[PDB]
Design a binder for this molecule. Structure first.
Ligand code: CA
Length: 156
């Protein structure tokens, strides 16, 4: 339906809602006015106990077969957290219904002192469901996300 260069999703978190982002694990995912990269608000994740926990977003309705997309956003650790590495991952059901974990970007070191840009391209060849999440190998890190975007690079 879309063409190269089109915005598929854009999240500033400047209204009341998490704009579809939801908890993965027994975590708390909500909007905060304490910190932001742009505007007044960002998306905050706390209460992580395992490394696979984080804020998550279904992409099932956003990304379709063989489309190349570009996923980006700005991240920062919650005040007090030690330096930790953050990346985006897509959990995908393949053609057979089997679970696959696809890498979007290399993990970047992030601190509680500055916002860091994360970005990578993504596509898939077979599958029925797609779930994006933001994770750290540090199982207890808490962190913020702002100015999240997905852009179509190449139509299918
Ligand atoms: Ca914002």
């Amino acid at each position: 339906a879309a063409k190269a260069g089109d915005i598929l999703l854009s999240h500033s978190f400047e209204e009341g809602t998490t704009q579809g982002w939801t908890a993965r694990g027994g975590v708390k995912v909500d909007v905060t006015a304490e910190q932001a990269y742009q505007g007044k608000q960002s998306l905050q994740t706390t209460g992580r106990t395992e490394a696979w926990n984080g804020p998550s977003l279904s992409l099932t309705d956003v990304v379709h077969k063989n489309e190349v997309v570009e996923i980006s956003g700005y991240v920062k650790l919650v005040a007090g957290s030690a330096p930790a590495d953050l990346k985006f991952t897509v959990e995908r059901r393949d053609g057979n219904g089997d679970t696959q974990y696809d890498q979007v970007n290399a993990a970047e070191q992030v601190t509680d002192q500055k916002w860091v840009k994360l970005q990578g391209q993504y596509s898939y060849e077979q599958g029925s469901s797609l779930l994006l999440y933001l994770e750290s190998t540090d199982a207890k890190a808490a962190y913020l996300l702002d100015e999240f975007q997905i852009r179509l690079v190449k139509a299918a």
